[PDB]
Amino acid sequence: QIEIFIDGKPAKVDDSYTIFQACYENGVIVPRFCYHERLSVAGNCRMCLVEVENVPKPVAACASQVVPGMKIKTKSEKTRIHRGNVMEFLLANHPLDCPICDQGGECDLQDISSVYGYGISRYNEYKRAVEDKNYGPLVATSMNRCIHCTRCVRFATQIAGVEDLGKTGRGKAAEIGTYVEKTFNTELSGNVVDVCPVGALTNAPYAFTSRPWELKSFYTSDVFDTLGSAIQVDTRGPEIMRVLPRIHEEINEEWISDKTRHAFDGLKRQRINSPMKRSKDGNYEDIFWEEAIQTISKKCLNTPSDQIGAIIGEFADIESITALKDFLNRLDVDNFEVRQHGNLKVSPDFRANYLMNSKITGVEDADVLLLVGCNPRYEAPVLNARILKSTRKNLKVFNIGTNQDLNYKNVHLGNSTKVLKEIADGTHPFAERLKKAKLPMIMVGASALEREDGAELYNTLKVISNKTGVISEEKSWNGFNILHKEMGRINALELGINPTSVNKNAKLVFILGADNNLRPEDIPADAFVVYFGTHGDEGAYYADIILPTAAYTEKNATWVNTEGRVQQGRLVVMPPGDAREDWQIIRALSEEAGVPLPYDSLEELRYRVAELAPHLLKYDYIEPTIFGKVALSAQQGVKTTLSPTPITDYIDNFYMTDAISRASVTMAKCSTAFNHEKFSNFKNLAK
Amino acid sequence: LNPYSYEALKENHWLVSDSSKKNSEWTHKSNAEQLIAKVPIIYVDSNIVRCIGGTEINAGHPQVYIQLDTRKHGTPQTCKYCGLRYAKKM
Amino acid sequence: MLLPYFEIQKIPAKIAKTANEKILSVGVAQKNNIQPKTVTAQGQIGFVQHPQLDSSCQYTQFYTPQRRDIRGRVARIYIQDTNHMHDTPQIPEGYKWTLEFERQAQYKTPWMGWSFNGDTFSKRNHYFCTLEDAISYCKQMGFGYEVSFPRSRYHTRKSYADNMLWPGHDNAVDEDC
Amino acid sequence: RLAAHRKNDDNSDSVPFEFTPENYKEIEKILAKYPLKQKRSAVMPLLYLVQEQNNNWVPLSAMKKIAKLLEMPEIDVYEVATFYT
Amino acid sequence: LNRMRFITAQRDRSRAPWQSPKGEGVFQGKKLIVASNSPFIDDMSIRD
Amino acid sequence: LFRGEHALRRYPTGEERCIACKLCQSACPARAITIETEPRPDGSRRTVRYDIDMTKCIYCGFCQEACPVDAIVEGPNYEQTAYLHEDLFYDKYKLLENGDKWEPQIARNIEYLINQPL
Amino acid sequence: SPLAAQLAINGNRNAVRYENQNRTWTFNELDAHTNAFAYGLTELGWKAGDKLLLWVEKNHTSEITTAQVGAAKAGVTLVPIYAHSAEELEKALNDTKAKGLLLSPNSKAGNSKYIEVVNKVIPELYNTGRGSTLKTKFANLQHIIHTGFYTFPGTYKFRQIMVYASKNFNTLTLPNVELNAPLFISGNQTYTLKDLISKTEENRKTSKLNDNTPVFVTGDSRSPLSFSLGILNSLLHGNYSVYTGAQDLNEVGQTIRFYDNALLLVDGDIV
Amino acid sequence: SSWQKLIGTNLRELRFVFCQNSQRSLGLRNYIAKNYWNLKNQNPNFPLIVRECEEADPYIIARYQYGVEKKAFAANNNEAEIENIIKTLVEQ
Ligand code: SF4
């Protein structure tokens, strides 16, 4: 705690601050190009130079600590001269590219020049020219605009964990990038664009299409991965133009994965825009809403209760599942699955059963992490970056299952389920390794829990946790975590739907937008299928009736995070064509079926939700639970027999994991450009 | 060659190509692509060339500088304002 | 200004009057119980509140013979900071609260492919210096509100000396393989 | 000189490189000259060794081999070999 | 007279409808079998 | 300097001068210019839509001053009287043919105007 | 073990180069990868005497070589097969009574891919439950491992059967490399490690090889002669091996022009 | 004791909603923390949903066939009266 002076006003800061940090906290804005709040401190540019008395040379605000009693004069003429000189040197070799540069209208170079520069040039010689490089279909390069700020190199090294970028050469002829012709293939690759202050690196799908001033922005959350990444959607009229990350510091920090950023263009094609009916020969005809609802209502009134089933889709929100559950309960139906295998063997009795009890930030708190059938590099790239940051700070990672090329170091305990049995039964060194750890943490992927012995694996994991001390009241620590793969499954668990209640033979199936893991043998050949959906890749080919619905960006809904956080997805554009809201369709069908539901707007539906579970009305919040040890208690006499089969992951192609991503053009381009290069049957022993 | 193949996309800035160049009279409402393709490559002696798109300043486009010292010798480069293409002489 | 009256900060409880809400009276009571009693800029839990079409909503000018759709709408109140594309804009953001209304109809008329709004309202956003001002405006004009609270980047220790650290003794053996 | 890798048929990835046993003894001596955790400090000497045994120039494959030997990224070897004239 | 080509393209810029199967088709149980409409090549299923 | 009917110009090679920078769209006080851009398959950035509502335009010339490649201009023509309101919805075909018809006079005038500072 | 001889001294030297995959390994990398393969087989209850059929095309040079050395380390017998129809594959499975089958799914056999032929021969693979053992008409068949990219029910990927064992926390063991253990059944003749080593040294003496001449193996590398003069020769003596499977002689010549006195093998036959 | 051995064919779900720390939900919280596994073992398939919120009132919601619900207020109820309330709820 020391006293400094900024433009004559005394202020109190901490002795560990830099001048830039003190100025920003005191409301003073200092121009900068190379400093970033999350990367290491570099002082290559000199735009943050300020003037301090008794110090002859200008001092870089970002790379200099504060001194007790010092005075910073950011409004003196000397500071103006320093900024003008630095801006002049920066613009001496910059190309006249603003009309063709995608950074125009949001370039920090432009704004800083306008506000702080001299305002005119005197350089009258040839500028340097740099040949462009090819980094892939996601990043476009125009290297005449680079100012050698090292932000991309520092981001790649310290955040992405990849070591492909650098600075080769010397003097003015030095160049930023890879030495050889190599693509910048990685998850979180597009993030580097947001880091680069100039148009040197640009969003290749978002090439030439838009300008910053003709866009309207909305705040929402992502559903492509079970981490509810906070995102900003920029649109122009009825067209969504781009997706950017936001700041949360508890989710995704500042960063989003490439699927979150780019797979939104799968909403522009393969869309279902009107209700349809399929004939016996397979012909599809567009019909009215009234006719479709009347047909389904007749089927509901005629079909026996035991022959009715449902499938819950990957992108199913709380309101839709509440509506369907209430309607089928009114119809005396308690089965919400018809698929024989692939069901999660987790009881929805307690919230701690199926949630991330240590939250996303828990990777920073734990010292030993054990992945069981989990591949964070593909299932949660931002969580993978967080784990990498933590492993740089004394976090040890062990893995049971398929060995993966994580950008950090992990110890392979084994491949099959025999390692887990050895750990649970003792006589394995990892039991003592867990016992000596301060805060042990176990992350089991949801995929490993749809094994035919998923319940036995769950019981074995509970036994291991209770024996080692992953769950302990003395430490007030709950290290048991499940990394889910579908948002709809999380919402169904939160509402209280048992995933293991399966109708063996159903003659009337409501498919609420489920396309993954769908095979023709699951649905009987003599059944009646009603598919609620937005895309026509799968499920729409099983359906006698197809009802168009609204995507996640086309409705106001509530989504539960994989750590238990309740979030609002907000309407950005109305659903195309004749599509309708899921709960509105279900309510209309219930009214036409003689069992109307007691809600007519979103407010009354949320009142019903509050009747079911109040915690779903608290947004951007996680409700604490005090039943962790009761829920995860190692029960006596429960089966713990595991098949001698290796534990694998569920993702082959990262860029295409669902209908929206499958209907995307940039995802197909990324697949074509990166799948052959990223595929390997051997471990990269360098990392 | 398939315009959707890996090689064609990679050597076309990851865009679907059009050798006939006749899709642009509908998509872009003009035949400028054909006309600019009718102009041959200009061979320059030095390693860098300056383009202004005309005989004088303000008649054309802002001064731009194009590098001709490429990783592969003699690879032509295109001005990003005007469609003219240049290559280093031999 | 961003950081600065009790009634404006008070969130009224819901009273069920519709038959549907009379059916779900337990849910209404639970929502009244769990929702925050008062709203302040220091809150962390966002919330949705219905419009209060009592005597207090008399100051609206948007209830005309041709317009019966503006009053009773639910706005969104949040802070919109500078995006992740630049750091030093000439006009900075994040110094005010934004009240926003969701779109109601957007299409393209076919004669020239021209973008058209089916609802002239909600085209632009409304800006207030304080959250209390936005909530007071909503209460005056008979609007409900979805209040969400800002998320800010944490403070961290930065120094150039962190770039040059001793790796340690060569004898530091890692027993974790 | 160009601060990038020129496309050359005789300087591709298929071009083989391997240190001689005498150069391997020199390599172990050089690594003995430096601390255990600072093997990358031997990048500059080893480069000379390459330039000794391959006609006064350093091929790309030799730089990849050096990167593998010193347990350092190839990009750092690229930067070191390009920085110094 | 060719107004529909312009209208359809403007509609398809932001919402391209899914082409429904027409006429008699091939059935495997209840699923209807058609060829994919992707112009991109799934090279990882033909590569080796 | 007379501000008449709008036109889109070309380089002497026949290439479009307009690079879809959207400066003219934001410069318009009447919001009469609508632009949409896609990358042309050869890679250059060009407009897929460039239209001006001539019933919204105030004929102020702010757009031709904003253009940095002299692509959009106001020509000398004033005899543009139309019988239908739809004849005044100018699309890219109309502006391009206006430029291709009025190019000599526009070139002469712009040549003199350019030489004036010199 | 003899196969670790080059590991004893100068394990940093380059051992093998896969030209078709642009992959170069040192002796340490090759040893680690083959150890991972052996450990992965051992974890799945593979003992001495188990048979592993190989139905793999030429482009998977590294996979084949790693499988061969891992089979040598783990004590399981390797048996290559050459099938072009469902009947041939069924006959091979019946004759060998193999416990596993390592294959490349995208390879062509007539008009159908390898994975399609496998599913035709074994109709139980499609309906096999997730994480459950195989229940086929074949007695000892337990594992279908493929080198491909996607996931097929009832089968496992090649990378999912690799256990990169650690210095600590390792509870497995690897049996000693026995010289008399069978390793290769091609053309109704059995081949153990001792016979392969003898063939290696005899061909070295006849063709005038030493520790300096590289060896270019092209085409199919499953032949015992290719194994003897390739990776086995590299492990025994330190010669450089270059695998150029599924490349025509023009590309092979363009690669071999960089080497001096290279000995070229085509489909296990000296050219 | 015999009431909890078998769940009636009309009962479909027993949902418990209460508070984490309020003295109002003290009895129901303690009852759930002590007798959950006793009911779960005898009915391994029957759902027993437990949800808690910061200020929620204690409720024991019983759901029957055809979507019939019967919600009972369980505030300031000790172990015996919670037992009796649940017994009566599972009795109709
Ligand atoms: S990066 Fe682009 S917009 Fe920014 S000043 Fe440079 S050329 Fe102009």
Ligand code: SF4
């Ligand atoms: S390409 Fe851009 S972000 Fe990267 S170092 Fe250059 S100026 Fe900085």
Ligand code: SF4
């Ligand atoms: S101002 Fe000129 S260069 Fe820019 S979008 Fe308009 S016509 Fe094109």
Ligand code: SF4
């Ligand atoms: S002359 Fe003025 S009003 Fe007319 S289009 Fe140009 S900028 Fe708009």
Ligand code: FES
């Ligand atoms: S911002 Fe301080 S030197 Fe770059």
Ligand SMILES: [Zn+2]
């Ligand atoms: Zn030019």
